[PDB]
Write a protein that binds this ligand. Sequence first.
Ligand SMILES: C[N+]1(C)C[C@H](O)C[C@@H]1C(=O)O
Ligand SMILES: C[N+]1(C)C[C@H](O)C[C@@H]1C(=O)O
Ligand SMILES: C[N+]1(C)C[C@H](O)C[C@@H]1C(=O)O
Ligand SMILES: C[N+]1(C)C[C@H](O)C[C@@H]1C(=O)O
Ligand SMILES: [Mg+2]
Ligand SMILES: [Mg+2]
Ligand SMILES: [Mg+2]
Ligand SMILES: [Mg+2]
Ligand SMILES: [Mg+2]
Ligand SMILES: [Mg+2]
Ligand SMILES: [Mg+2]
Ligand SMILES: [Mg+2]
Ligand SMILES: [Mg+2]
Ligand SMILES: [Mg+2]
Lengths: 369, 369, 369, 369
Amino acid sequence: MKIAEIHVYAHDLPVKDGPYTIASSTVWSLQTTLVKIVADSGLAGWGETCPVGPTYAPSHALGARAALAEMAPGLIGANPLQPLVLRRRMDGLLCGHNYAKAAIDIAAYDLMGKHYGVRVADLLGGVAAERVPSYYATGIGQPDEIARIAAEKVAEGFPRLQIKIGGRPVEIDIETVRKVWERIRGTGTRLAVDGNRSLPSRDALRLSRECPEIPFVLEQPCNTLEEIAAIRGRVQHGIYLDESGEDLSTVIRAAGQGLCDGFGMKLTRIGGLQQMAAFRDICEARALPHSCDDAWGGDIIAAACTHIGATVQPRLNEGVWVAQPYIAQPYDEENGIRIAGGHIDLPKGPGLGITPDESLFGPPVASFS
Amino acid sequence: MKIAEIHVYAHDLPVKDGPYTIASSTVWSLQTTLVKIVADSGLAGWGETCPVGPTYAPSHALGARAALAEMAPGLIGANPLQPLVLRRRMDGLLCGHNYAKAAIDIAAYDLMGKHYGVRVADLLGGVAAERVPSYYATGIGQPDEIARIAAEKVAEGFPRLQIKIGGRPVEIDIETVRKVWERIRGTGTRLAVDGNRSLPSRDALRLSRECPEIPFVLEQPCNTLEEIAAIRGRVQHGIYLDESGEDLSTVIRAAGQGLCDGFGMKLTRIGGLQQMAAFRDICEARALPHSCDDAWGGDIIAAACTHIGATVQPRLNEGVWVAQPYIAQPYDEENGIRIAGGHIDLPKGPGLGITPDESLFGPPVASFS
Amino acid sequence: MKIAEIHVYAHDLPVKDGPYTIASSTVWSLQTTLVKIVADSGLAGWGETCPVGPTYAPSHALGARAALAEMAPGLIGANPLQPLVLRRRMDGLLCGHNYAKAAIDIAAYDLMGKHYGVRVADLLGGVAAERVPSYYATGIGQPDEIARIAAEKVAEGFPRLQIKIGGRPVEIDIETVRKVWERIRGTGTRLAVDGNRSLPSRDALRLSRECPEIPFVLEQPCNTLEEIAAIRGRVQHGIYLDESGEDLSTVIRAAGQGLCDGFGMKLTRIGGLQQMAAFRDICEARALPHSCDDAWGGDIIAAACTHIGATVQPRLNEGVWVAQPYIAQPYDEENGIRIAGGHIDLPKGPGLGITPDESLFGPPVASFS
Amino acid sequence: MKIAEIHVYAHDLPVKDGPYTIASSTVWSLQTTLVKIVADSGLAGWGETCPVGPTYAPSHALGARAALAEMAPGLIGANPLQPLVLRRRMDGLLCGHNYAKAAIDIAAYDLMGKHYGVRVADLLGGVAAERVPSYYATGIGQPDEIARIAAEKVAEGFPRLQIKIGGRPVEIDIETVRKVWERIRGTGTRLAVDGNRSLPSRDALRLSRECPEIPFVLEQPCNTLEEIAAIRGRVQHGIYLDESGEDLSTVIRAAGQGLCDGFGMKLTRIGGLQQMAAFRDICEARALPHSCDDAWGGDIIAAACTHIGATVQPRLNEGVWVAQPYIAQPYDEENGIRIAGGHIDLPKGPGLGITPDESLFGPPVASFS
Ligand SMILES: C[N+]1(C)C[C@H](O)C[C@@H]1C(=O)O
Ligand SMILES: C[N+]1(C)C[C@H](O)C[C@@H]1C(=O)O
Ligand SMILES: C[N+]1(C)C[C@H](O)C[C@@H]1C(=O)O
Ligand SMILES: C[N+]1(C)C[C@H](O)C[C@@H]1C(=O)O
Ligand SMILES: [Mg+2]
Ligand SMILES: [Mg+2]
Ligand SMILES: [Mg+2]
Ligand SMILES: [Mg+2]
Ligand SMILES: [Mg+2]
Ligand SMILES: [Mg+2]
Ligand SMILES: [Mg+2]
Ligand SMILES: [Mg+2]
Ligand SMILES: [Mg+2]
Ligand SMILES: [Mg+2]
């Protein structure tokens, strides 16, 4: 098999009842980028990458499209059924830019699954669970209001909550954590507190020191991995990496040196499913719980996240986060990814199990053959 | 003296009022393996190895018999009165497989003791105590029920309890520990909490962080020694190794680098009494308390554990655990190992002090001469 | 699809012009164990595991068959198209025993490849090279004798030589290394020197110190990883792990903490292709060169090694070692694995590309349904 | 059985063709202390301790007798057939003073062996070799003079030489090492260079740096273990501890943290055979070569060293050093320890196999009942 065409699309996703606030990024609408790979046989696969604003991570929508335009001519003729070979070929065309490479990677797995008649999760080691947990991430807000929302989401069925903090005096974050805990204690709901790179070590230390009785994991409290390595010995709560886990080498450093207790891992950041599967295997060997998330995006990226998440040993699965609740229009109304009772049912069809209504995207901003 | 015959037996041991639940293994009946060594003089010694299900450790009943069948022809003619020489000879025939080698080792010490007219404990440095402490290990269950059982076992005389946890949400484990402590506090009963390799560092950290007022030692909370080394600086409760202590080299690493505060050590895992005695000497030099246990098994392995345990400095002796309370039929009704008042009286006769009713075992599954 | 039957075979492999001498194992004839998995449809896949004598590693032929006998009944009905799910299922039946699990893993990948019509290497990320390099490993022998063989094998086309040392005064090992280097310098041939766990740190230090001008990597010079970590900073030659690389967790330690510069890795030791592929991804992220070998065995295990080897980035591929030159009768007369010009061609057919002549093995020694 | 009497003897040992020059002690005549333990039955065992002058180690002849006088009354009635119980009993009477405790330890093993009819080596795991290697240690002297003696002693059969250095400009030590190497290279003789605590790190660094082509191990180059840990990474020669190995705890530190590559170990320093056997097991698990020596003394301490030495794995046995060549009158004319061909035959009789002629010692200087 050979790649015959690659099509790049720009598409807009407004935030229902926004904005969505992260200590490092507030957005009102997201620009996603879709990739369609067409084989010489005519069969097509789909990928997607959607940064959550331009300030969250070293990635942005215009940059995704620039990266894809750089690599695409060099990929025409490649065998899309060989994800590692294909990844090396991308590396031969452009250094870094995992978030763009990930879209090609995901399209190729979709195409592979359709070709062989198999679900992507089964190409990645096998379906361990047909329905996977999700988690709900609150925005930054008034303590009482965040606690109210947390209670509601637990009642909806979410087995885990992530409370966003930072960008304001830490006393308010601590009050938020305490008020949330008062409403969810004794429900068995797991808790994460995400500083999104915004806390000086001063405040990360204070948060943990003041709340030993509250069972959160502290997710990416500080900006750099060096700062996290420096506070870890003095912090009695588990610490998870998110933004710092930028590649497999960094994950190997963190696992091998005992620098964290788990991960919030994004598919596009790590470079796609080929790398994410290796990431999964590393975490399983070391009993490091993790989520399988992305920054944002619709059915295509969400299905890719759900497929890898379906392969995770259940006791290590911290959930699959998706932007679906904030997206008005699905790409696939019959099989698209939907949260139900705080969980996500894996699509049942071949490949990603998603057939996007291509009409929605508009003509490609760039085509290659 | 020379070994003239080696006989290998398969024998079944059903669990009274089971199953017995460990986070890593639930069993309903155990398959033990017995070894009889006959000297040219006609004198015989007995050994035993009995994994606690095939998933607890890298060992199983069929594997024990395969290992013994591999080594046995190469041991005919060896001097059974030289335990170190004999161990090196085994190593010359098969790499690893300590749990099988241990059965030959124990049979040889039994034979040595009978030949010289001395108790095995006196071959291992001398009887420091005629009666040794034991400890009772609970299964995993409802918090209140486990607390009730803990109170009963303290009333029976057990000076130490081990609470098994893991394989479920850690909130339940923590509730169990708290309810047990409420019933046993102020009795002077020592407490261990055994995660049996099942806790991610996330949960080990939480358990310790939440319970500074409860004086447990945390036994093998995490799967690998690397994970334990990573959490140790952040855990204020003593940490003991069990499954990780797979050989004397590992014990030397753990003692020399300060990676743990004690051990739950199994005779078969370490490779027998020759190695266990060295283990004992290392712990004594570093004031590291430990038990002398095994995975399971009847009078033969239990007596071997009791003999080495009788040599331990009393202040370091965390007890000898035996499967006797879960075994309906003793091998030796006159001198077999029995728990009385939470303690074990050392047999008074030469060798292990045990004469098994060989009839019980059936014909050997393999014989060598 | 579901596993309907599992059949275990025992088969002898006489060493051509024997014996083969490793510092830890001298072998005259090897006992291989073959496994055939049959699906409900009748489609079959083949696996193989063959310890290189019982003292090289904690593995042996009788032990392989005992482990398979323990696991097989619990695998009837499993889906063989899900290698990770299947591996966890095996872990739920027996702890450890990777060398036995690997035979099931390999048969399942063979079956998967046949079912989808794809080569195993293309189920593991894709073929990076159709012609895979091998390496020649000399046995221990006299310095001039070994230097001759080294020159002869370089001429035959092998791009890398491994010289086995140990088990005798180290000055003889050093003389051998110097005389081999005299023959092969200027031929572009890479050099490994394998101590096979046999050198005290005293001697490993001496070997490196005396030979800075000879560009060997020192493979598993000492018995334990702890010993290797202790000399590493005092050794100017690259150090590779072999025997110490017992599982993915240990690989993560070694890579993350920088304890070695590469690996000799055996498929059965790591537990099969699912784990080997993850191992490959770990090494690629850290630019750690490695081989894809096994202990011994015929066309089945050799094809498995060749398929994973064909996925390795060429600049990191230290070779695929196979026992074929020492094996008189191939299982597959037409398409079995053969070394040609010091290299190995990847088979063309689906699955492993091997069709064993079952009549060579005799009837199964154990059958499960 | 019970100790009925303890008798302490003082005896002079003139140095044949004296003196003997160590960087830390020059000696013309040594004051040995013998101990006879008599059981209720009248059976007796013998021990010995003989510091090599009062400045080599924190031990001296008057100190040996004072320590024995302190402990002896508290040992009347003890069971001498339990070496570990007996050792703890001594610890309960006097802290430290291993060199004195060792004399009691050795007499008790002698008695035990006589009582059971077994050789001491067979009470310590078993005889691995009937003929034990020794090593020759040169005194400090002129480079050409020492090189001659080195050649002469190699011819006599010693498989290892130890060259003493220090106490003068290091260039003279380096010249000595080079001239010795010139004589013994190509003879298969192993080389140790002993600084006896006398080199500043400045000079130890220089000695190793200048001589990479000379295969010595550097024994106790610096005064403290702290100094040795500090230079270790900058020294390419193996480093052995001698004087720093004061107890089992320090051995555990050195081995567990990889601070040395072997030991010169003295029986009296470590505290007797009970501790020496544990020391042996520690070294065997880590492939650390070691000698079994003492400071000085006649047939009694020499036989004790020979018996433990006969249990050491041959590949790790650096030799048993004894003072016999410097001692005119043996205690046992028939079966005393004698070096022959640079090796020592293990005595055949029960216990140590030595029967001292008591009349040589004079009446006891102290008797206890
Ligand atoms: C993955 N989230 C839950 C959604 C946002 O993209 C960021 C947030 C996190 O940082 O974990
Ligand atoms: C030794 N036990 C008390 C009995 C079981 O064999 C396991 C358990 C332990 O892991 O410590
Ligand atoms: C891979 N070999 C060449 C074959 C033997 O199985 C061992 C050897 C090695 O240890 O590297
Ligand atoms: C063991 N010696 C050879 C004899 C002396 O007691 C000291 C010396 C050494 O330090 O190695
Ligand atoms: Mg819930
Ligand atoms: Mg985050
Ligand atoms: Mg009590
Ligand atoms: Mg335990
Ligand atoms: Mg070539
Ligand atoms: Mg090797
Ligand atoms: Mg059937
Ligand atoms: Mg010689
Ligand atoms: Mg010395
Ligand atoms: Mg008296």
